[PDB]
Structures are given as structure tokens and as C-alpha cells.
Design a protein around this nucleic acid. Structure first.
Ligand SMILES: Nc1ccn([C@H]2C[C@H](O)[C@@H](COP(=O)(O)O)O2)c(=O)n1
Ligand SMILES: Nc1ccn([C@H]2C[C@H](O)[C@@H](COP(=O)(O)O)O2)c(=O)n1
Ligand SMILES: Nc1ccn([C@H]2C[C@H](O)[C@@H](COP(=O)(O)O)O2)c(=O)n1
Ligand SMILES: [Cl-]
Ligand SMILES: [Cl-]
Ligand SMILES: [Mg+2]
Ligand SMILES: [Mg+2]
Ligand SMILES: [Mg+2]
Ligand SMILES: [Mg+2]
Ligand code: NA
Ligand code: NA
Ligand code: NA
Ligand code: NA
Lengths: 554, 243, 61, 61, 61, 61, 62, 61
DNA sequence: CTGACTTCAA
DNA sequence: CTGACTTCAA
DNA sequence: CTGACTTCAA
């Protein structure tokens, strides 16, 4: 029937305390969604090629990093993506979880579409002309669920296109599009390259060996929803690894038995002494010196490691910045060397509704981790047999230039990843961060993904697609390319239920622990005012810290 | 989806006990909120003239406070006039010695949603049509998480006339905001400074709640209805006699 | 006059309330809230603050 | 001397939108909540200052 | 065949190509949503975008 | 998963776009003054994020 | 001899113990040199504060 | 004749209830009493100077 | 009424 | 289909 | 009378 609702709206976050410290967290999320007609009903093979010889074109010397050229299959379908922390938790929920829990893991997911409404638009009068909206009671909306994951995975969180983060504000799905293989090659140059230097900037034709054109219609069963219909996905069970809600601080210099002091400090302002390093017990892996020091001591393994930056590698697909594992930026504040992430988002995902201009909000996330990062400027390599102190020919440091390039140092191309490397898992970023991810279908997989905390061990939740069915008008001739449609749009509710499994943290230190808190200090990053509505209701939800409590590594 | 009933029935148990059942029904009107946002609004009547708190001795005129204005409305029937005819009150007061609350239940039905459009131009008239698929949202704070706001105190409960339409009251609640006002009389010195301040939100006392994040919400289309179920009161009997 | 009231959630409570004859000993009847759901129009862009809605109202018993 | 004192407590609910006030430690010099105050000194001197309680607010009515 | 440049949601074009020989445009990289691991620049580009992992790698030779 | 070594390059950080010759290391740059030796000959970008296919089965040899 | 740096200061990155080879590259192949006292191997007769020192080269030859 | 224990344990019952068991242990020192008698002692600070109760307005002392 | 690229976590 | 600040007067 | 940071490899 047309006069009865097909679902219930619910946004509540409930905490079921099992006992033994286990907690079942059930995050209910509901949104009103708006869906319009596609600008085209065709699947299009679109190309973007920013090869201008001015501005930010790839045809100007040294502009490789500006490359945007690629090819995509544009589809008339839309994607309903809720894979972002902000969709499921209120800021206070995140705080409660981060301050009191030690671990968190994905449990299950289910989604539902209901209370579908389809309307048509018509013109009124002439002077004026106003628009009139009517119900198309017999019109329908199409829904498809890629449960087998046949179609390319496209996490909307990476382009800030997931559903909004405000339960009381309408949202919309994102238009679905996916990459298509297209040969692409770009020459490398610097702003100092010769004047008559030719920049090779090419794009090729489709290749038989790598072409994959998929349509929703030929691969997924499609459900038609009229105003009285509803759609449910059923429950999906996640298979992922638990995420630690704690952060580590022990570096290589903090592993094991500290050297024994000779005597306790003589006063509260005094320092202590060790026994002369020439008479000290211990071990090192520098056999040319007869002493041990904290810097030379052998430690079990290597916490963290040096990563090349800003490394750009090249493929048939063009140049690309190689991702880096997110680690502590250190006191040296080496953002790029330690993979700090800078994201740009809009008003549905955190930006102040009052902010003006086309520019999005920007935020740089630095790893909570304090023990695995690298302070590149203070790093160095000495020749062996080691000499202490070394002369300039026996040491390679930040001041030394590679291939005579003033700003290029051994650390830019240095990679110390090895069998002894140990490091933490990337932080979960509230509320902009992605939550789960699909694993790459390659025989040899990565140990982690930089973009999300939970990579699905098994098949991930399939994507949910929607679109309006064509609304034809009396004039229709298949043999012509003339397109005559009735202006239509729809709205419907979406409800998702995401369940987590968490565990309350133990408490054993003497000193109080660090906790995410709010405050009343003017201009403070944690001022309550930031999480309250303004006089006219404007909101903004800034990134919140996570993993505030430290845990012992060894 | 429901039946209209306003009758007040008296079930005489015997032994002098009486079960009084007050049925009340009203047609309600609900419009769109002037805003869909939750707003943190401030009122500060600190004018230096008239009834401002900036004029000597006007402390008692203070109206400054802060509130969370919401796009929701409250259906409040907690006032005697909603349940009894004047004669009922008279009968009870003249013949009874005690009265106590027993139970309560509420229901929303025969929902109707309409849209308004403009006609012609000279004139322009309004035309009203049924949105058969549109809905009205309903929420019941059975746990009492949200601030209690008895509409009787601002004369905003449902009307007292069964044959006249009424409307719910817009829901809004107090929010903590530092406020301080000096004391003076009309005879205070001329150059007397009146301290009249309001502060910023305080972390220690800020509580911003939304209906959407705390209560399950039901969507009612024209063919749906909503019932609360029966609630049992636990209160002390009221003496109908005076000393 | 008001008929029932919620008790103040303080450890030490008042012997009565001036505004109502019956203060609930236990949890009082929860409040009933209502509102119209937004009625969107063909033009809608979440990234803008432009608000385009269909003029709507309702009645119910 | 050994004593065993048992308590019964209940985890708090979480319903507000805005983050809540929490007792935390910090690294700001001369701050009342600087960690240094709850750590031993070079010679082992200790001191335990009063800590806040009831940081989270609840609605009275 | 998917390289790092082919992983995930492609950037959204502003409009569909105007003809079969035309190209499409993205929104100015200074106003584009997305993420990178180069915090010194306020824009996102296909080459700078953060991708899940690294497909393939450089080997000494 | 392959690498087009001549089109690979490394820039200094904070990144500068476009970079001048001292802010970029490319194929034209010589290591230890050896004309044909470039950073890519001794570069190894294998890491925790590396993903790649399995070698092909070669028929019939 | 790779020294990396952290909030904790500089430190020599450990190396996997492997054959030092005919070239006798101790540091490149993580040979371990330890210093110990009379309870753990040093000759009880030895005099001086200096501990006993020994460099262990991996049995591994491959 | 006993065991020393200072641990504070948290037994999470479920439903949010928690049984907190605080164990406390101390080494105590006990000396001889300065007297073995029960004494009826009097303190009377009625000096006419300093903080005595014999100086005007010193009642609170 | 999600299951690893179809049906078919039947 | 009202139950004391979630689920859960289950 | 060792069990992954409490109790609680109960
Ligand atoms: N009392 C208990 C004990 C374990 N568990 C479950 C929670 C998890 O699913 C699992 C332990 O997780 P794993 O270990 O990270 O055991 C529970 O729910 N209740
Ligand atoms: N015959 C009777 C006797 C008592 N009662 C009930 C009415 C009240 O619930 C209760 C007495 O109220 P309490 O005493 O104020 O007993 C009744 O309903 N019929
Ligand atoms: N699952 C439960 C439920 C109640 N209880 C106990 C804890 C308290 O002793 C009592 C409730 O306390 P009262 O209400 O403040 O019930 C429990 O221990 N476990
Ligand atoms: Cl940097
Ligand atoms: Cl050596
Ligand atoms: Mg299936
Ligand atoms: Mg299948
Ligand atoms: Mg309930
Ligand atoms: Mg409850
Ligand atoms: Na030592
Ligand atoms: Na850090
Ligand atoms: Na985009
Ligand atoms: Na050997």
C-alpha cells in the first residue's frame, strides 16, 4: 500500500556490556537521501587529460605531480556508501570508546532502504513561472547489491562522498564511476630543465589485454522499488583483525634492561652516572670498538623504519606517489617521511557550515604513535670498521647531497625495512576516516592498507547501488537519439546497523592516564563550543584524537 | 486508524471507590519548523532603557538565558483543563474526599499531510493537495533522557475545548551559560556600574542532545497510527478537603 | 494547573513542588515528540547551505 | 596489615552529541594536572594532590 | 592491470564530454576533496592521492 | 606491477611543485659521478605495503 | 652502520647475524661483540676493571 | 601468617555493573605508650597574649 | 535477505 | 506499545 | 603453583 511506512528511523548507539569487560556496541544510523536523474542514461568512457602548457598542466616543466589524466567508465548509477566513522558515532561516543576501551573489532552489518518517494516536476503559469511537484505513485527506484563484488570497489570516504555525518540533515548517494585501463606516459623534468626540452605526455587507445567494461544491468539482479516497497540486505558478518585502541612509545632506546647507575642521584636536581663505557657489560654489533653505549647496544629488533620520500614511481598508468606507512612524525616534525595524512573535505563531513568559498576544509593527521617514527635530520650512517668520532668522509648525514642535488639526501631514497622491522597499525580517524577495506586480489598481498584500519580477510560487504528508472514521455522513438524524459527525482530513507565488539581497558599504572577531554579555553582545539550548534544552527565536527592511553611494548 | 472520544466516565466500584476515566481527543495542526537545525540561541535583555537589566533596580526583569532550539514539537496534555468539563471538576470537588492518578495512554491517528502551491497571478490563490506518501515523525522519550518541559507553565498544552483544533508546542530546552547581574536600587549613585555579563559554553556543564541520536523514531504516513501503550502512575493521593 | 511532575534528580529532594499536585515517585510519563519530515524539491545540494523545500503541513488526531 | 574493600559501581551511559568533560593529565609546565606531579622525583620523593571527581554532568530535570 | 593510478573511486568529472572527441574536466585541484600524504600542498591530484597500498615495487638492478 | 624506471623520480620534502633541479632526483642524475648509474639502479622500494602477482607459467620451457 | 633517530635519541639499527665471509665484514653481517664478567666466563684470575670481550661470527657460511 | 596484596581488581559483571575489589597492605610500626595509664587530660589555651582565648575577639581560637 | 568474478556461503 | 540516562520494567 | 595489561589459562 501507498499510505503505510515501510521502515523505522533509528540513530541510537547502544552499549551492551557482556561482562568480563566485553562490550557489544550497536551503531544504528539513519538518513533521508535525495536521488536525482542521471545527466545521461548511457555508460560513458570518459577521459581526463590535463596537459595544458600553462598553469597546472602536465606540459609545463616539473609539473609531473599535478597529473590527473586517466580514463573512467561513467555510469548512470549511484552508490550508497556509509563506510566512514562519522556516519556511525556521535563525537561523545568516539570519546567514550577511546578513553575506556583497549580494543575494537568489526562484528556485523545490515542495511535497509524504505519509505521511497518518487516525484515529478512540472512548470506553472508564465509570468512569473513556478515549479509544481507531484507524486508519481507508480514510478520506481532501482536497487542492486553487488554481494559477489564483481564491480570495482570504490570507497567514497577517499573522496569525501559517503553519507553525511549529521542524523538530522539530508544526504545523497554518490555517482558511481570506475577506472578503465588507458596507456599513459609522462616525461620527468624540473623547473630548471633546458628551454627546448620536449615533454612527452601521451595517452593511448584501449588495449584488448586489459579492457574491462561492466554494466550493472548485465551483472547484478535489480530490484524495483515503488513507494510501498522496501529493501533489505540481510546481515553480513565481518572477518577482520581487532584494532588496538592504545598507542606505543618505546623506541629502540627503551627496549630491555637499562644500564645500571652507579649511585642514586644526590638531590632532586642531580643526574646519575653509569660505569665508564670501557668497563661496562653489554653487547653491540660494532666489533671495532671496546665499549658499550646506549646508542650502540644490540636491541631485539627495529621499531619503525626509514621509508623513501617523496617517492614517485611510474607505470603504464603514469606517475604516482608511493604510499607511506603512517608513523610518528617525531620532534623533527617530518610529515612526509612518516606518512602524515592530509585530507580535504566538505560540510557534510566536518567543515563548518558557515565557512564560505569553494575551498574545502583541510586537516593533517599525524600518527598518535610516538615510538616508530623517524626524525630524518638526526639520522646518519657511518662507515665500518666504525670510527668514533668519525671525520666527514666516514659519515653520511643530512647535509650531504646525492648526485650533487642540494636538497636530495641519502634519506630520501633510503629504505631500512627488513626482517627485524616492527611497527604499529594505522590510526582510526574520526570522523573522516574509512573503516573497512577490500583486500587487493594479488597472490602476494600487503601487510596492511594505509587508507583503512580493517582490511577484510574474506569477501567484504558488497556495494549498494541505486538509480531512478527512466520516466518516458509520449514521444519515444528507439531509432532516434532524441531523449524525451519526465523530470523526476526521489527521496528515501536509509538505515544501517553496524555492530562492534570492544573490551574495557585494564588499569595498572600509578600515575593518572592521558584522556581525550573537552575544555573551555578560548581558541583551544578542544573547546566545547566547537561541538555545539551556533546561534543559527551551524555545525562542524573536527577530527578527534584516538588511542590516548599508552601501553607497554616490551 | 482511530476513534475520537472525549467522554468522562465514572465507574463506581462500591465501598465509595470510584474509577474515573477521562477520555480526551483533539485535532492537531503541525507546520514546518522555521529551521531544520538545532540552534544554540541566546536572549540577553541588557538594554539601558525600558525594562532592560542595565537600568538601575531592574534585576527582577532579567530574561537572559541560553536554549537549544529544536525543530521538533511537543504534544503535552499535562493540565487539568484537557481532561475535564467544568461540571466534572465540580462533581469531583463537591462529592469526593481524595483523588489519585492511576494510568495514562496516548494515541495519534488519522494523519494527513498536505502541500501548498500557488495559483494564477492576478489575483494569486493557494491550492492544497494531499501528499499521500509524505510522513510525520513521532518519538517517545520513555526513558526521560531529554529535559522535562511541562507546557502548562507557559500555557502551551493542548487546548481545553474538545470542539476546537489545537497544536503542539515547539520543543526547546535550557543550556548552561554563565550569567551574572549586579544589584542596585533606583536610588543607586549616578555613576554606578551595573555588571551584566554572560559567558561562553563551559565544558563541565554542556549538554547538547538531539532527538535523532537518542530516541527511536516512527514514520507515520496517512494510513499509519501510533500508540504509547499504558503507563502506570506511582503517586500520592491528593486530599480534596481543606483545613 | 499542571497535574503531574517529574522529581528533581538530586540526592536530597524537596518535600513537594509548587507547580503540581502529583510528583511522580518513579519515572514519569515520557514526552511525546512530533515533526514533519523534510519535503525536498528537485534541487538539492548537500555541499551548499541553500534550502529548497516544498511548503508542507499536517493534521492528525 | 591487609584490608579488602569491595565496591559496586556502574558504567556510565553516553547520550550527548558533544564530547564530555574528563579528568586528564597533561604536559604543560606549572599545570595543576601535569604528569610530573604523579611521578617520583630523582630521589624518589612523591606527592599526591587532590583529584577532581564527578567530571561528567547529568541532567537534573 | 590496475596500477596505483587505478585504485578506488576516480575523481568526479564536472560534466560529461560534449562530443565523442572531447575530454572532461575535474574540479580545480585546489577545491577538490580527497587525501594525500604531502602536507605541504593544499590540493589533491591523481598522482598525489593516497592509495591503499603499493602495487609492484622498485628492485635493484 | 612493473616499473618504467626512466619515468620514476624522488622529490625532497616539504614538497615543491614544480621542483627545481636540487629538489628532485631523476634518471639523468649520476650516482658517485658514474654517468650510467642512477638512483634507480640501487633503489629498493619493497615494503609492508608492497603487493604483486605471482610469476607466469612458461609453456613449454 | 645505520643510525636512526627517534624521540629517544639516536640508535644503531640491529642487523641480522650472517656469515662475515672471507672478506671478514663484521658489521655488515651483524657479528655480535659482548662484554662480560667473571660470573659468566671471564677468567677469575684476570685483573683490571675491563670486562672480557668476545666477537661472535655466525657459523653460517652461505 | 599472611600474604601482602595491594592490587585493585575490576570484575565486570555485565549490564554495566562492576565489582571493584581494593586490596591494601602496609607494614606498620608500633611503639610503647608513653604511659600505661588512662589519663583524663585537659587542654586550656587561655593565655592573655598571642592566640589565647583571653585576648579580645579570639573566640575562634 | 551481501560471501571472494555467474548460479551458488545453494 | 512509556519505566528512572542506551539496550533493557528484556 | 607463571599464561599475552587486573580478577581470570577461573
Ligand atoms: N565473556 C565473553 C568472552 C569472550 N567473548 C568474545 C568476544 C570476542 O568475539 C571473542 C574474543 O575476541 P578475540 O580474542 O580478539 O570472545 C564474549 O563476547 N564474551
Ligand atoms: N473496594 C475497593 C477497595 C479498595 N480499592 C483500592 C483503591 C485504591 O487503589 C486502594 C486504596 O488506596 P490508598 O489506600 O490511598 O484500594 C478499590 O479499588 N476497591
Ligand atoms: N546484572 C546485575 C544486576 C544487578 N546487580 C546488582 C548490583 C547492585 O547490588 C544492585 C543494584 O543496585 P541499586 O539499584 O543501586 O544489583 C548486579 O550485580 N548484576
Ligand atoms: Cl615534511
Ligand atoms: Cl667490519
Ligand atoms: Mg547471492
Ligand atoms: Mg558467488
Ligand atoms: Mg523501552
Ligand atoms: Mg531504559
Ligand atoms: Na650496565
Ligand atoms: Na606522536
Ligand atoms: Na572528486
Ligand atoms: Na662462517
Amino acid at each position: 500500500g501507498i499510505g503505510v511506512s515501510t521502515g523505522t528511523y533509528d540513530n541510537q548507539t547502544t552499549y551492551k556490556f557482556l561482562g568480563d569487560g566485553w562490550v557489544e556496541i550497536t551503531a544504528h544510523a539513519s538518513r533521508l537521501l535525495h536521488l536525482g536523474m542521471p545527466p545521461s542514461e548511457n555508460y560513458c568512457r570518459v577521459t581526463v587529460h590535463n596537459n595544458q602548457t600553462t598553469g597546472h598542466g602536465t606540459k609545463v616543466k616539473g609539473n609531473m605531480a599535478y597529473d590527473d589524466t586517466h580514463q573512467q567508465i561513467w555510469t548512470p548509477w549511484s552508490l550508497v556508501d556509509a563506510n566512514a566513522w562519522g556516519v556511525w558515532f556521535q563525537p561523545s561516543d568516539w570519546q567514550f570508546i577511546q578513553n575506556s576501551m583497549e580494543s575494537l573489532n568489526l562484528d556485523s552489518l545490515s542495511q535497509e532502504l524504505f519509505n521511497v518517494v518518487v516525484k515529478t516536476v512540472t512548470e506553472q503559469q508564465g509570468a512569473g513561472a513556478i515549479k509544481v511537484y507531484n507524486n508519481d505513485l507508480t514510478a520506481c527506484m532501482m536497487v542492486a547489491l553487488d554481494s559477489n563484488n564483481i564491480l570495482p570497489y570504490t570507497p567514497a570516504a577517499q573522496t569525501s562522498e559517503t553519507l553525511g555525518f549529521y542524523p538530522w540533515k539530508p544526504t545523497a548517494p554518490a555517482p558511481y564511476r570506475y577506472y578503465f585501463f588507458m596507456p599513459r606516459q609522462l616525461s620527468v623534468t624540473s623547473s630548471n630543465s633546458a628551454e627546448g626540452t620536449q615533454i612527452t605526455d601521451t595517452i593511448g587507445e584501449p588495449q584488448a589485454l586489459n579492457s574491462q567494461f561492466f554494466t550493472i544491468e548485465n551483472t547484478l539482479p535489480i530490484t524495483l522499488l515503488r513507494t510501498g516497497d522496501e529493501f533489505t540486505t540481510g546481515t553480513y558478518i565481518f572477518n577482520t583483525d581487532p584494532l588496538k585502541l592504545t598507542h606505543t612509545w618505546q623506541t629502540n632506546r627503551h627496549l630491555g634492561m637499562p644500564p645500571r647507575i652507579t649511585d642514586l642521584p644526590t638531590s632532586d636536581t642531580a643526574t646519575a652516572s653509569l660505569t665508564a663505557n670501557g668497563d661496562r657489560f653489554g653487547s653491540t654489533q660494532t666489533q671495532n670498538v671496546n665499549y658499550v653505549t646506549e646508542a650502540l647496544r644490540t636491541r631485539p629488533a627495529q621499531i619503525g623504519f626509514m621509508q623513501p620520500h617523496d617517492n614517485f614511481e611510474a607505470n603504464r598508468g603514469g606517475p604516482f606517489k608511493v604510499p607511506v606507512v603512517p608513523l610518528d612524525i617525531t620532534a623533527g616534525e617530518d610529515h612526509d617521511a612518516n606518512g602524515a595524512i592530509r585530507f580535504n573535505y566538505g560540510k557534510q563531513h566536518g567543515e563548518d557550515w558557515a565557512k564560505q568559498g569553494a575551498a574545502p576544509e583541510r586537516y593533517t593527521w599525524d600518527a598518535i604513535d610516538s615510538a616508530a617514527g623517524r626524525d630524518t635530520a638526526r639520522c646518519f650512517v657511518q662507515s665500518a670498521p666504525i670510527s668514533i668520532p668519525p671525520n666527514q668522509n666516514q659519515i653520511l648525514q643530512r647535509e650531504d647531497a646525492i648526485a650533487g642535488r642540494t636538497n636530495m639526501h641519502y634519506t630520501n631514497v633510503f629504505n631500512s625495512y627488513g626482517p627485524l622491522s616492527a611497527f604499529p597499525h594505522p590510526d582510526p580517524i574520526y570522523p573522516n576516516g574509512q573503516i573497512w577495506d577490500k583486500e587487493l586480489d594479488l597472490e602476494h598481498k600487503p601487510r596492511l592498507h594505509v587508507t583503512a584500519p580493517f582490511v577484510c580477510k574474506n569477501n567484504p560487504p558488497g556495494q549498494l547501488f541505486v538509480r531512478l528508472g527512466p520516466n518516458l514521455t509520449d514521444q519515444f522513438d528507439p531509432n532516434s537519439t532524441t531523449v524525451s524524459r519526465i523530470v523526476t527525482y526521489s527521496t528515501f530513507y536509509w538505515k544501517g546497523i553496524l555492530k562492534f565488539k570492544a573490551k574495557l581497558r585494564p588499569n595498572l599504572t600509578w600515575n593518572p592516564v592521558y584522556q581525550a577531554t573537552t575544555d573551555s579555553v578560548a581558541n583551544s582545539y578542544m573547546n566545547v563550543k566547537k561541538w555545539l550548534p551556533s546561534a543559527t544552527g551551524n555545525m562542524h565536527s573536527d577530527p578527534l584524537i584516538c588511542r590516548p592511553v599508552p601501553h607497554m611494548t616490551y
